[PDB]
């Protein structure tokens, strides 16, 4: 792969800790409730939870380091920017989630539209496009198989929050921003 | 017009498609109410209301093309980002209008400060500013004549809400910018 | 000092005056409450409140101007959108202070992360923690002297908001930009 070892783990623990701090927020405020007792939590979540996420995370910041032309002027200040628009989204979802759908959806939409405007390029809203898709349909067959449930205000596509989508966009577009970073950032002569 | 008359219709639907997401959502939150039931209704709102705001858009665009040294280096990038402001700056007075009036009208004001300061200059804060006076001045006609209503805690400005006068800024500013886009997009040698 | 006598007096009265407006939102939303029925209130606040507040915007502002190269290329666009981070972070506090600490403080923290990312540089990180640290500590003195209290779901830093570190980080950042823009706005060749 074109990340080091080193590189993907740093990623992988980025993720697993901003999910369960998200994860928290979603539960704490009966956005979420999981079903799941059998098996050993982290915080809030299931220990599966943050592995998935912090998963995520590294591979998408992977695969955009597939895509043409990682840009090599990506830097720290941009990644620590991205990440905060991300985390500040997806706790913003576990405030407002009791609220119609409209309204919530859009907000969320346009929290993604900016992230992107600011920090993405078109390889990066490509990756937030695969995850937008890949993340909402094993939340969707999760829910299926009963291992947690969105709040009944929450739970409109396919009994997930359709704010999953923008949401999920834009930690894809970040995660290949953080990509892009591990590479840039390398000892240069 | 320095518009062409495809740019002013995309101008047009543009506007009236965020302002039908931003009216459906003060209707479903309680925001407003209407009190019109002869007329035709386009989702929560009367037929005439995205005529209204899809001709300001596209006569603050033309507006701006009158005033000094159109910005040439605009792109679909910054319009794009600026278009998500002011949707999520007017759906997200519709989650917060039942809070007091200062925080929820200086809270509106921030964002608007922080779209100019973005993505504004001179003569888009002064389109911003002739919006801001002709919007929330309609507005008042409009509820005077018993139209509408806003809800009793979103009321204080003459019977309109007071985070009208920023978020309506916010709106002049985007719609100078999307002129200005207007132009610059078009072919070049 | 580094600042003129002029310059302080406007970051004062800058300070002041948003910090009138930020405790207001606490008080009317019940997010703080005051117990000092002895002394003059100007607005919502005891008038000793936006003095303290005033002073330290100018003292931040001067700290700065002490540290490693202040830039000259600060803007007073630049100010005015960090002014209004604030501002609007600061109100924000007032209308979620009721939900729960975490996701309360880690939108607090992503919006000072973001300002930081956007306006400031290492010396101003610097003024951040240093006011995030003072700011937090003299709140808690008041509360143990029982000059005011906080609201019974924001008081978990030992009496007092958890969101008030980043708050305060965010100010400190803000200040420091208020500095340096002091300076680099004198009149030039
Ligand atoms: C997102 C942030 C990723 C941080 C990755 C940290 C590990 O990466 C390594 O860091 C070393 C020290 O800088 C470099 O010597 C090396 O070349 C680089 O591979
Ligand atoms: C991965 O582990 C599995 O996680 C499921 C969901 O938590 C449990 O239903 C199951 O028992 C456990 O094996
Ligand atoms: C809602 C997401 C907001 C995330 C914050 C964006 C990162 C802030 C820093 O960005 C960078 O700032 C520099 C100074 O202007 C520019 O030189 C550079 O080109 C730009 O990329
Ligand atoms: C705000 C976005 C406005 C989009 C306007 C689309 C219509 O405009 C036209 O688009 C053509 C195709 O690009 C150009 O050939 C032509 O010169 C230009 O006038
Ligand atoms: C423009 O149409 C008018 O709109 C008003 C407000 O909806 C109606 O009161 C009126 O009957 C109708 O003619
Ligand atoms: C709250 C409103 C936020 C709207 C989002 C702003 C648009 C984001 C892109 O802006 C543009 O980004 C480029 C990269 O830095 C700069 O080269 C350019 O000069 C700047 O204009
Ligand atoms: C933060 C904004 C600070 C505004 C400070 C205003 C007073 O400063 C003074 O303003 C004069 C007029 O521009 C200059 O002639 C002078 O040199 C400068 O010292
Ligand atoms: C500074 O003034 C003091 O402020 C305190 C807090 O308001 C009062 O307790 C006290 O009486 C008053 O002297
Ligand atoms: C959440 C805090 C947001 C505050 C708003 C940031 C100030 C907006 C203007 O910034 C400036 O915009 C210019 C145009 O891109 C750049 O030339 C310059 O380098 C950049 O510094
Ligand atoms: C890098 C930040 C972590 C990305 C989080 C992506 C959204 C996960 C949403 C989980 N779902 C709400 O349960
Ligand atoms: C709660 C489920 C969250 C799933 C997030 C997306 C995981 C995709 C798997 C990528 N490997
Ligand atoms: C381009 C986005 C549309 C601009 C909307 C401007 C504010 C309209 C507010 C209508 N009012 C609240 O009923
Ligand atoms: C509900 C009324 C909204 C009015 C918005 C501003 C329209 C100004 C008319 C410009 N022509
Ligand atoms: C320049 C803006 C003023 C800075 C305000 C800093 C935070 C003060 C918080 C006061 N505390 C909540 O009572
Ligand atoms: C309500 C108390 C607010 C205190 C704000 C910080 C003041 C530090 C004093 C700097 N001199």
Same mark, same amino acid.
């Given at each position: 792969?074109?990340?080091?070892?080193?590189?993907?783990? =740093?990623?992988? @623990?980025?993720?697993?800790?901003?999910?369960?701090?998200?994860? !928290?927020?979603?539960?704490?405020?009966?956005?979420?409730?999981? !079903?799941?007792?059998?098996?050993?939590?982290?915080?809030?979540?299931?220990?599966?939870?943050?592995?998935? /996420?912090?998963?995520?995370?590294?591979?998408?910041?992977?695969?955009?380091? !597939?895509?043409?032309?990682?840009?090599?002027? =990506?830097?720290?200040?941009?990644? *620590?920017?991205?990440?905060?628009?991300?985390?500040?989204?997806? $706790?913003?979802?576990?405030? $407002? !989630?009791?609220?119609?759908?409209?309204?919530?959806?859009? *907000? =969320?939409?346009?929290?993604?539209?900016?992230?992107?405007?600011?920090?993405?390029? #078109?390889?990066?809203?490509?990756?937030?496009?695969?995850?937008?898709?890949?993340?909402?349909?094993?939340?969707?067959?999760? /829910?299926?198989?009963?291992?947690?449930?969105?709040?009944?205000?929450?739970?409109? @596509?396919? #009994?997930?929050?359709?704010?999953?989508?923008?949401?999920?966009?834009?930690?894809? /577009? $970040?995660?290949?921003?953080?990509?892009? *970073?591990?590479?840039?950032?390398?000892?240069?002569?």
């Amino acid at each position: 792969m074109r990340l080091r070892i080193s590189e993907a783990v =740093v990623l992988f @623990l980025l993720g697993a800790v901003a999910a369960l701090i998200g994860d !928290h927020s979603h539960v704490v405020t009966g956005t979420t409730v999981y !079903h799941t007792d059998a098996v050993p939590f982290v915080w809030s979540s299931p220990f599966w939870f943050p592995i998935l /996420v912090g998963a995520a995370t590294a591979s998408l910041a992977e695969l955009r380091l !597939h895509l043409p032309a990682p840009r090599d002027g =990506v830097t720290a200040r941009q990644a *620590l920017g991205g990440v905060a628009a991300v985390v500040g989204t997806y $706790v913003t979802t576990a405030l $407002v !989630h009791a609220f119609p759908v409209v309204p919530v959806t859009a *907000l =969320v939409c346009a929290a993604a539209a900016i992230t992107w405007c600011v920090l993405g390029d #078109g390889p990066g809203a490509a990756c937030g496009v695969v995850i937008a898709v890949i993340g909402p349909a094993v939340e969707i067959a999760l /829910v299926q198989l009963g291992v947690f449930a969105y709040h009944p205000d929450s739970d409109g @596509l396919f #009994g997930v929050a359709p704010f999953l989508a923008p949401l999920y966009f834009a930690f894809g /577009v $970040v995660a290949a921003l953080l990509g892009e *970073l591990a590479v840039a950032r390398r000892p240069q002569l």
